[PDB]
Amino acid sequence: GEELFTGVVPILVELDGDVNGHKFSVSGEGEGDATYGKLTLKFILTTGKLPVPWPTLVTTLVQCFSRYPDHMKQHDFFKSAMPEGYVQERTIFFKDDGNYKTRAEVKFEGDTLVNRIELKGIDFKEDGNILGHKLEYNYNCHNVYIMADKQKNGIKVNFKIRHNIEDGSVQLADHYQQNTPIGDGPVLLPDNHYLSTQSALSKDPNEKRDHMVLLEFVTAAGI
């Protein structure tokens, strides 16, 4: 698994979502440098209207591209799971608003690491922060504490996101995630540790379409 990320690995992201009955589809393209922990990615609205601000979809739209220093390479579940992949299942709640429920399967189609997603979002208020587009186009460093689940030969990941709002307030969003290998073969089940995470949103000055340009850095530590 580790040996498949030695390089700059191309990457594709297909998203299908359905927020309060608002169907859409997104389509990301970019590479990933596991060595540098580094993601570069253009996103693209392919079908329909976007009922949600992009920062909401960030954590949803490849933890196998996290940098693991040599002394906890024996903790890198995401990459051992390869090339057959893993299932990443999340529910995100939004304090005093709705929630997303998220299934996705991540794996190589040949040389291309593919991330294909179902999303479904319910009980968002027509005049709330989310559907109202009340969110500062930005993103803050976050930590992702990763504990094991021998029970389901997988991992369990608690973290929260502080979405900046236009007012000055914050729209927190509690993430409950569990990752399980698609194949049947042995994986590395880490000791307790986190991933320090950095996301920078931007725009293509030459893209008429509704898109996101995203530079990420994910390094591990803690151990």
In short:
With 223 residues, the chain is mainly β.
Main attributes?
11 strands, DNA, 11-stranded mixed barrel, Green Fluorescent Protein, 4% helix, beta-barrel, 52% strand, mainly beta, 2 helices, fluorescent protein, 223 residues, green fluorescent protein
**What is the CATH C-level name?**
Mainly Beta
Shape: globular
The helix/strand series, from N terminus to C terminus, equals EEEHHEEEEEEEE
Counted beta strands? 11
The biggest sheet amounts to:
11 strands, mixed, barrel
CATH architecture verdict: Beta Barrel
Strand share of the residues?
A: over 45%
The first-to-last residue Cα distance is 22 Å
Compute the CA-based radius of gyration: 17 Å
Oligomer: monomer
PDB class: fluorescent protein
Keywords: green fluorescent protein, beta-barrel
Assembly: monomeric
Entry title: Crystal Structure of C148 mGFP-scDNA-2
